[PDB]
Design a protein around this motif. Sequence first.
Motif, PDB file in Angstrom:
ATOM      1  N   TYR B 372      35.779  34.591  64.161  1.00  0.00           N
ATOM      2  CA  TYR B 372      34.926  33.368  64.085  1.00  0.00           C
ATOM      3  C   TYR B 372      34.305  32.806  65.384  1.00  0.00           C
ATOM      4  O   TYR B 372      33.803  31.678  65.438  1.00  0.00           O
ATOM      5  CB  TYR B 372      35.715  32.256  63.345  1.00  0.00           C
ATOM      6  CG  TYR B 372      36.762  31.453  64.121  1.00  0.00           C
ATOM      7  CD1 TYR B 372      36.410  30.610  65.165  1.00  0.00           C
ATOM      8  CD2 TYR B 372      38.100  31.489  63.745  1.00  0.00           C
ATOM      9  CE1 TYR B 372      37.342  29.876  65.849  1.00  0.00           C
ATOM     10  CE2 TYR B 372      39.050  30.743  64.424  1.00  0.00           C
ATOM     11  CZ  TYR B 372      38.662  29.939  65.476  1.00  0.00           C
ATOM     12  OH  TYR B 372      39.595  29.194  66.161  1.00  0.00           O
ATOM     13  N   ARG B 373      34.265  33.669  66.379  1.00  0.00           N
ATOM     14  CA  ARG B 373      34.062  33.414  67.794  1.00  0.00           C
ATOM     15  C   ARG B 373      32.639  33.860  68.018  1.00  0.00           C
ATOM     16  O   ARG B 373      31.853  33.263  68.755  1.00  0.00           O
ATOM     17  CB  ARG B 373      35.018  34.198  68.687  1.00  0.00           C
ATOM     18  N   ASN B 625      37.870  45.053  59.128  1.00  0.00           N
ATOM     19  CA  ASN B 625      36.976  43.998  59.586  1.00  0.00           C
ATOM     20  C   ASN B 625      36.762  42.873  58.579  1.00  0.00           C
ATOM     21  O   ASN B 625      36.798  41.700  58.944  1.00  0.00           O
ATOM     22  CB  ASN B 625      35.632  44.602  59.986  1.00  0.00           C
ATOM     23  CG  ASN B 625      35.759  45.585  61.135  1.00  0.00           C
ATOM     24  OD1 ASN B 625      36.712  45.526  61.912  1.00  0.00           O
ATOM     25  ND2 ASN B 625      34.796  46.492  61.251  1.00  0.00           N
ATOM     26  N   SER B 626      36.563  43.228  57.313  1.00  0.00           N
ATOM     27  CA  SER B 626      36.350  42.231  56.264  1.00  0.00           C
ATOM     28  C   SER B 626      37.583  41.357  56.064  1.00  0.00           C
ATOM     29  O   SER B 626      37.477  40.138  55.942  1.00  0.00           O
ATOM     30  CB  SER B 626      35.970  42.907  54.948  1.00  0.00           C
ATOM     31  OG  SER B 626      37.070  43.614  54.408  1.00  0.00           O
ATOM     32  N   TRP B 630      37.734  37.455  56.756  1.00  0.00           N
ATOM     33  CA  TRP B 630      38.095  36.542  55.674  1.00  0.00           C
ATOM     34  C   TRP B 630      39.212  35.615  56.136  1.00  0.00           C
ATOM     35  O   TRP B 630      39.219  34.423  55.825  1.00  0.00           O
ATOM     36  CB  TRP B 630      38.544  37.317  54.435  1.00  0.00           C
ATOM     37  CG  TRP B 630      37.498  37.484  53.381  1.00  0.00           C
ATOM     38  CD1 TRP B 630      36.462  36.638  53.106  1.00  0.00           C
ATOM     39  CD2 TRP B 630      37.392  38.565  52.448  1.00  0.00           C
ATOM     40  NE1 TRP B 630      35.718  37.129  52.058  1.00  0.00           N
ATOM     41  CE2 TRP B 630      36.268  38.311  51.638  1.00  0.00           C
ATOM     42  CE3 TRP B 630      38.138  39.726  52.222  1.00  0.00           C
ATOM     43  CZ2 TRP B 630      35.871  39.174  50.620  1.00  0.00           C
ATOM     44  CZ3 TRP B 630      37.744  40.582  51.211  1.00  0.00           C
ATOM     45  CH2 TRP B 630      36.620  40.300  50.421  1.00  0.00           C
ATOM     46  N   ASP B 631      40.160  36.191  56.867  1.00  0.00           N
ATOM     47  CA  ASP B 631      41.245  35.448  57.491  1.00  0.00           C
ATOM     48  C   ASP B 631      40.700  34.436  58.488  1.00  0.00           C
ATOM     49  O   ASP B 631      40.950  33.230  58.378  1.00  0.00           O
ATOM     50  CB  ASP B 631      42.206  36.424  58.192  1.00  0.00           C
ATOM     51  CG  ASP B 631      43.654  35.982  58.121  1.00  0.00           C
ATOM     52  OD1 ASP B 631      43.921  34.858  57.647  1.00  0.00           O
ATOM     53  OD2 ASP B 631      44.529  36.768  58.536  1.00  0.00           O
ATOM     54  N   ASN B 632      39.958  34.940  59.467  1.00  0.00           N
ATOM     55  CA  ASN B 632      39.350  34.116  60.505  1.00  0.00           C
ATOM     56  C   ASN B 632      38.290  33.107  60.044  1.00  0.00           C
ATOM     57  O   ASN B 632      38.059  32.109  60.726  1.00  0.00           O
ATOM     58  CB  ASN B 632      38.728  35.011  61.580  1.00  0.00           C
ATOM     59  CG  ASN B 632      39.760  35.591  62.532  1.00  0.00           C
ATOM     60  OD1 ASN B 632      40.729  36.234  62.110  1.00  0.00           O
ATOM     61  ND2 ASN B 632      39.567  35.352  63.821  1.00  0.00           N
ATOM     62  N   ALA B 633      37.639  33.358  58.911  1.00  0.00           N
ATOM     63  CA  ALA B 633      36.764  32.339  58.332  1.00  0.00           C
ATOM     64  C   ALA B 633      37.524  31.108  57.834  1.00  0.00           C
ATOM     65  O   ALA B 633      37.056  29.980  58.004  1.00  0.00           O
ATOM     66  CB  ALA B 633      35.941  32.940  57.197  1.00  0.00           C
ATOM     67  N   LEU B 655      37.652  30.022  50.456  1.00  0.00           N
ATOM     68  CA  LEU B 655      38.018  30.907  51.558  1.00  0.00           C
ATOM     69  C   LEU B 655      39.462  31.396  51.474  1.00  0.00           C
ATOM     70  O   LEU B 655      39.765  32.515  51.889  1.00  0.00           O
ATOM     71  CB  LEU B 655      37.798  30.199  52.896  1.00  0.00           C
ATOM     72  CG  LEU B 655      36.364  30.174  53.420  1.00  0.00           C
ATOM     73  CD1 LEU B 655      36.311  29.488  54.773  1.00  0.00           C
ATOM     74  CD2 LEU B 655      35.812  31.585  53.516  1.00  0.00           C
ATOM     75  N   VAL B 656      40.351  30.557  50.950  1.00  0.00           N
ATOM     76  CA  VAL B 656      41.737  30.960  50.739  1.00  0.00           C
ATOM     77  C   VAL B 656      41.835  32.120  49.750  1.00  0.00           C
ATOM     78  O   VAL B 656      42.483  33.130  50.029  1.00  0.00           O
ATOM     79  CB  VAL B 656      42.596  29.786  50.228  1.00  0.00           C
ATOM     80  CG1 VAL B 656      43.894  30.298  49.618  1.00  0.00           C
ATOM     81  CG2 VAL B 656      42.886  28.815  51.360  1.00  0.00           C
TER      82      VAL B 656
END
Lengths: 690, 697
Positions: B372-373, B625-626, B630-633, B655-656
């Motif tokens: 998310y960076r 990556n996905s 999804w985690d980082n979003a 998002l959860v």
Amino acid sequence: YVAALFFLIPLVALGFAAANFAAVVRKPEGTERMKEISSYIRSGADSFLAHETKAIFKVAIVIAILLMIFTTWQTGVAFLLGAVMSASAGIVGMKMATRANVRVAEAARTTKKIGPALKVAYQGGSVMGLSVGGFALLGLVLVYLIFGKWMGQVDIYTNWLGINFVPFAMTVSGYALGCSIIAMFDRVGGGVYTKAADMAADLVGKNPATIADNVGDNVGDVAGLGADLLESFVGAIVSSIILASYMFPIYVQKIGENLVHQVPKETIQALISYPIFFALVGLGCSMLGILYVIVKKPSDNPQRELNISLWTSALLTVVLTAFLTYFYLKDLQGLDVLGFRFGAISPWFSAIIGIFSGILIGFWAEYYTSYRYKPTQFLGKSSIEGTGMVISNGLSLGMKSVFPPTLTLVLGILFADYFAGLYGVAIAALGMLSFVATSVSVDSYGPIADNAGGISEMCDPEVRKITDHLDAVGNTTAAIGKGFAIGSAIFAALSLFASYMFSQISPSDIGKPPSLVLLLNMLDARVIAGALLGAAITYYFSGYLISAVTKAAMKMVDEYNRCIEITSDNALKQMGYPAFIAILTPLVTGFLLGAEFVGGVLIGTVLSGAMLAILTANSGGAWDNAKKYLEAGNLEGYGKGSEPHKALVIGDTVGDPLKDTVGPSLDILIKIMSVVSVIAVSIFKHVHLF
Amino acid sequence: YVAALFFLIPLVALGFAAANFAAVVRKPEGTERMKEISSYIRSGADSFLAHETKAIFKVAIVIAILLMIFTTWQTGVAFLLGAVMSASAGIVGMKMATRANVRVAEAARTTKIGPALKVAYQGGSVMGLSVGGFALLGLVLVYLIFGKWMGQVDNLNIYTNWLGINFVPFAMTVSGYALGCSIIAMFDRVGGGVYTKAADMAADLVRNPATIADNVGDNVGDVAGLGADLLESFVGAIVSSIILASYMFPIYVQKIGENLVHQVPKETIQALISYPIFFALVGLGCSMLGILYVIVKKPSDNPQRELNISLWTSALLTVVLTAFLTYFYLKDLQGLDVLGFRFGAISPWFSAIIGIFSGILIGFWAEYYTSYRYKPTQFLGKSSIEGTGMVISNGLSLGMKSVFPPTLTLVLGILFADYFAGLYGVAIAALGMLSFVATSVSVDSYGPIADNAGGISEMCELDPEVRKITDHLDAVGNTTAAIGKGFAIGSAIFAALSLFASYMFSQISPSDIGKPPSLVLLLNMLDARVIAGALLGAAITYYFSGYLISAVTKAAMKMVDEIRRQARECIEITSDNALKQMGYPAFIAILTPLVTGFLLGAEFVGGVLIGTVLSGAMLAILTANSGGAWDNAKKYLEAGNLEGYGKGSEPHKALVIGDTVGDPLKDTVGPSLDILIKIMSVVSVIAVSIFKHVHLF
Ligand SMILES: [Mg+2]
Ligand SMILES: [Mg+2]
Ligand SMILES: [Mg+2]
Ligand SMILES: [Mg+2]
């Protein structure tokens, strides 16, 4: 004599279309309202039809001059003919569908029952199928008659730029490219439109501008599905001819300073002509198959009806072909050397295998996607465990669902090659895709019926009962159909990879053993890299289209022919982009890295595209039918509302872009990229950079 | 010697670990609650380690016996040695981790953040050094004993065994070793990976209810599993270098006037065999120096900077020392021309460099798409305002696209590798990529240690200011792990592709001897058997991926029920069932070449290996990556970065759900594919000895 009689078969196919057209139009519509809703969807398609054709034209122009300059004028001419033949089908099929629908719904009331309403709905669909068959074969007959015989192309050239090829091989490659171009736009463009609308529609919970979506339902499985099979059909025939043609210079022996064509002119010319005559019989059988079902006394079960046409068309093709195969090539000589393990009869066996493969692949696609059997039922019932679970289980289902149809492909290919060599693989594709007219008809039945049902919905319950029954069968035959169209897509592309490699024979390769000229070595780093590149490109391709659908959907969402023109324009812009990938990749990589690298890319593209097309198709359909499953009432205590239904809604919305846009686009990618490569390897074999 | 000097490096690596173990052990834990919690997860881990260890043994023996009957007794011993070596590393790393976490965490309070990073990193390095030390020690053993003592590096002609099965003695021997590493790797991933996520699911399917099961999971995956994974690729790269060299001897023979002339002579082959070993040794030596500097260094406020220095230090060092090593060891050689060595002697050092940089780039790509960076995740995050449907489709879209840049990097890396040093150069590139695997694994192993340290703070509730440091450590763990995961996938692909080359070289028959190489080093894609193989291998890779999703949830539910049945009226229960339901995927992995091979021969399996690697490579990148994105979003919104207020809000819920879908994909499906594309190649390299000739149809 018997020759031309066969060559007018596409005409008969066309006249039958032309008749079915007549017989549909004379059917009535009830009320101002049935007509009023109808006009909305019919106009919507043309608006959509206008911008794309116009867009196609611009692209079709650039490609044509190029083929003439770099290859030969015949090739450039042939290309436009193929583009027009497929183009024409789409213009005809779209027009028919959006008028036939109403007269089904009215059938469900004027004639007042469902059996005489199925006879109506199915008559319309067959126009698309016969035109697909008729046009595609008419074109090839033209190219064969004009360029092949008259100009003596059937009687190895190197052109004014020193680019070398067997003229006719090159010529039909252009024709193939034409069909490819119209298919790509119809899929990679029309596919974005249809699901942009479905999304958009499903994003405004209150009479919304759904009409866009309603034309979409027609756009997708009539025009798009139809164009796919035509290309694979043409792809299968063209590939059979290319391998055959190059076999002539390939199989020469040097006997005391003479060149002895170990496969002689007579043999080559028949193996070239053979798939066309085969295809004519295919087209012919479907006509018998179509008419029988048409003329028959009606039924209560339209699924059984539709199925009679396929089997009849397929049994018929299997039979006459054996005679066709046997009597033809009867005394030919060197079929051994050609790769014909059992002599004369060999390629008929290949066709049969393809046929049986096709039927099986259909069952498998359905099996994993239809509640009634186990995989979709579980997904559906897993909705009670949450949204996460629905999504996860659907992914798991589709990843697994890939194995049986691919295994079906694996065994079929293995057996195919035993009977008739690489040629047998291409003939298998053709047999698989023989009776394509009836195949495309059953595909096209689905949208024709669906709107009819909708048309009932927009304006009784007793009437809706017939309406609902027709649709249930449409949706199934559509799911079987995609699955079948993907099977054929894989088989075509594999034939087309073979075509790519035969097309690489150089004057400077002459003499050497087949095993030294028909070769792409995987131990070669370029080929491995190629394969990885093509695989990454296919995933990228798939990825872009998901985001594309949402982009466009959103473009529509912010606010009926205008809203369609708006997103259609935006749809086109975002079609170009995939198309560079689709069309230029062989060119770019070829001129950079040569024939070995591109061989890789094609393989990666085909392997990855085969897997991903199936995955998305089955899991996407599963999610839909899982939604359906609960809605009919099967989880007990759960129905049309509730957190599992919501989870299934979420799953269907994830599913909707994937099964109807991504997967079907991949069908085209694995094919057109191969066709292009077949053509351009003429040039970048020698002229590549590194 | 000069060589014995080199041969004791693995001993030191182990001792260095052993010392680092001591110095960590001597670190303290705080509260009784802090101690009690440590023992909870540590005991929890042990229950699981026993059952897994017991299972590999049962399986490892049968394979060992089988190898001994069909190949040579030597091959089977080497295999067990390899099985023992990787096992050991995992057993050691896990022991360290479950004691080290607290003393990271306690640093975050007793001393106060810089000396907490200093604690945490020492533990991780034991796993990394053991991965390096063991794997090469094992290889040193196999090289010294089986290669030199039993004279296989003295002979290295084409041998025919007690069953009339033929192979090059040394090649075959080291192939067993690679297989050894593979089997403990497969179990650790396909078993521990299902467990890890069965637990995570179960926990997230309800402090302290079943969290502890999940907390041991966190170590299993990225310490033991990741450490074993990278170990295999490491060993896989070296073994492939050795296999290619050995078989290069009989390939480059020319019949001249009924004489046999070895165009690449004995001296060259023996060196080319030994070269990759010394390279890996130099790497480890360089990595220890890389490791020692950062530990001893004055502390920082940036633990990222610490960790990164160790990597860079280990890698620069390896580039440098290797080039002397490479030039001088191959300084005056002969037949390198015929070998494919475009620039004579120095050639493979360039390949290694290509691999190193490929590795580093591939790491970057994994971060870019997952953090998310940067932008791809930012968009996903922001799309949460449009609903659950959009999040899933957009997340899928992200990972599909995310496959291209690392793969392009892989494409370019392979291409250059082969230009410099031929097929051999591809494997050396793989080796170079992983030449500093020790420091790499440490940073990987660093990750779970921090996460638990953080979690331990939450359960114990030790301050917020202390908790502030704890949360910081964890954030970085999760990042370096995604870089790490990313790198291990890159390296898995390069290794797998090298192992494919090995598979083909291993096919030379006495009856192919003579003929030009280009007629013998051949897999024809136009051949239908190869095409079918490739399709079959591709579909199998998808099945494998699909099964594991279902495997995790099956197992998960069984855990959920173990909570439900204990609490309405452990650890071992869900771990065993996770194991039981692993054989089946493992059956797929191991028997598929055999079945298809004995059915259809060397061409078909060749197809399969290509399909397997191609499909597995693509799916691996996508899922990593996905799943990370999804985690980082979700996190992105949790640190408060929309405007939607966040946190139990409607976008957050969406998002959860995406993250719950993603977690088995990034940590189970994807990482298993790393193993699949490798072990299937190793199995094939060995079994192609038999089904080349003996196949059914
Ligand atoms: Mg719809
Ligand atoms: Mg729908
Ligand atoms: Mg964490
Ligand atoms: Mg989580």
